[PDB]
From Swiss-Prot:
PROSITE patterns for the chain: MAPK (PS01351), PROTEIN_KINASE_ATP (PS00107), PROTEIN_KINASE_DOM (PS50011)
EC number(s) stated in the UniProt entry for this protein: 2.7.11.24
Protein name: Mitogen-activated protein kinase 14
Post-translational modification comment from the UniProt entry: Dual phosphorylation can also be mediated by TAB1-mediated autophosphorylation. TCR engagement in T-cells also leads to Tyr-303 phosphorylation by ZAP70. Dephosphorylated and inactivated by DUPS1, DUSP10 and DUSP16. PPM1D also mediates dephosphorylation and inactivation of MAPK14.
Organism of origin: Mus musculus
Tissue distribution: Macrophages, monocytes, T- and B-lymphocytes. Isoform 2 is specifically expressed in kidney and liver.
SMART domains: S_TKc
Subunit and interaction comment: Component of a signaling complex containing at least AKAP13, PKN1, MAPK14, ZAK and MAP2K3. Within this complex, AKAP13 interacts directly with PKN1, which in turn recruits MAPK14, MAP2K3 and ZAK. Binds to a kinase interaction motif within the protein tyrosine phosphatase, PTPRR. This interaction retains MAPK14 in the cytoplasm and prevents nuclear accumulation. Interacts with SPAG9 and GADD45A. Interacts with CDC25B, CDC25C, DUSP1, DUSP10, DUSP16, NP60, SUPT20H and TAB1. Interacts with casein kinase II subunits CSNK2A1 and CSNK2B. Interacts with PPM1D.
Length: 332
């Protein structure tokens, strides 16, 4: 068992193996940057805030540990290490997750570097490639936005989740559908792509309803085919009510852009989630020809998420989490 050291940073106390040197903060769980002296790389250290405070928190802790432990893909955040100062289940009350410190997010990049069409292909290609994998394990990200996209000096990308979100949220979510499928993440990708091509936020609404309004003027009022899947009378009227803005046409919002780019965007920003293009199909799209390769776009191992439909006590969630820490095996 490694020897630990203690440190207080922005009134928050950190307890790490001596291996992790030079803790400097970078967010508030809270997160630090450190030097992993084992490999000479800078890493990010997440220390969970109040991990087992309530049944909900405790499940959320177990979840996040399970997710990270599973993600083994180049375009998705992976676990380098998880540790705890605790010598035993009984002492156990802090959890720390370690990952590769990626340089900067997609927001930081766009601000002082002005993307080429070639940049957009490679970047969107990587999100998509990460998603095919994600989605293959029956996981839905749900909060894709440029702050959740890490990009290194070589403009190579990882998807993660730092726990405005709304500009990229699928509309079915802003109307509260409960069902949700995987192509909510495809809507988010089209909001991200849009902005990369235009340099402006596609749906900058002052509130969720103003955004629904701008969503509907561009993509169009729901077609009979779609309204047919909406069980609720009050839902069916309200969507017609928000589609009263003068109709705006797609291809005139994206005028200087590669014609294949606009085509792909028309296939992701489809109102009916059932007719929206999936990550797997998107990768084969002719906009990604310089990059697509089907022998190098894997899917994930089976991910046992039976825990998600479970209600257990705090101490059970905690004991489960503690097993996942002990059993962790790092990558070589
Ligand atoms: C698999 C997928 C979809 C990409 C998810 C990743 C994460 N976690 C993640 O990106 N972790 C980290 C972020 C930033 C720095 C870190 C630094 C070190 C370690 C982890 C770090 C998910 N969750 C669950 C929902 S939640 O409980 O609201 C928020 C977090 S879901
Ligand atoms: C303001 C815009 C109107 C929102 C209607 C968008 C319809 C989105 O698509 C719908 O999403 C559901 C996701 O659970 C699916 O189960 C439905 O079958 C699908 O048609």
């Amino acid at each position: 068992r490694p020897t630990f050291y203690r440190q207080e940073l922005n009134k928050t106390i950190w307890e790490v193996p001596e291996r992790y040197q030079n803790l400097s903060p970078v967010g508030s769980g809270s997160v630090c940057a450190a030097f992993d002296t084992k490999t000479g790389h800078r890493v990010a250290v997440k220390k969970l805030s109040r991990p087992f405070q309530s049944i909900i928190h405790a499940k959320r802790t177990y979840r996040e540990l399970r997710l990270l432990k599973h993600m083994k893909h180049e375009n998705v955040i992976g676990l380098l290490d998880v540790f705890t100062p605790a010598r035993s289940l009984e002492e156990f009350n802090d959890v720390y997750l370690v990952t590769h410190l990626m340089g900067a997010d997609l927001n930081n990049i766009v601000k002082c570097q002005k993307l080429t069409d070639d940049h957009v292909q490679f970047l969107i290609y990587q999100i998509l490639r990460g998603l095919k994998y994600i989605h293959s394990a029956d996981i839905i990200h749900r909060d894709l936005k440029p702050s959740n996209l890490a990009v290194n000096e070589d403009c190579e990308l990882k998807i993660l989740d730092f726990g405005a979100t709304r500009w990229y949220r699928a509309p079915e979510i802003m109307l509260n559908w409960m069902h949700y499928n995987q192509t909510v993440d495809i809507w988010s990708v089209g909001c991200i792509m849009a902005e990369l091509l235009t340099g402006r936020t596609l749906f900058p609404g002052t509130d969720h309803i103003d955004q629904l309004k701008l969503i509907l003027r561009l993509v169009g009022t729901p077609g009979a085919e779609l309204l047919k899947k909406i069980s609720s009378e009050s839902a069916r009227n309200y969507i017609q009510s928000l589609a009263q803005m003068p109709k705006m046409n797609f291809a005139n919002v994206f005028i200087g852009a590669n014609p294949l780019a606009v085509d792909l965007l028309e296939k992701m920003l489809v109102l009916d989630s059932d007719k929206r293009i999936t990550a797997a199909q998107a990768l084969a799209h002719a906009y990604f020809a310089q990059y697509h390769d089907p022998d190098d776009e894997p899917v994930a191992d089976p991910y046992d998420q039976s825990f998600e439909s479970r209600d257990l006590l705090i101490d059970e969630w905690k004991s489960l989490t503690y097993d996942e820490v002990i059993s962790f095996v790092p990558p070589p």
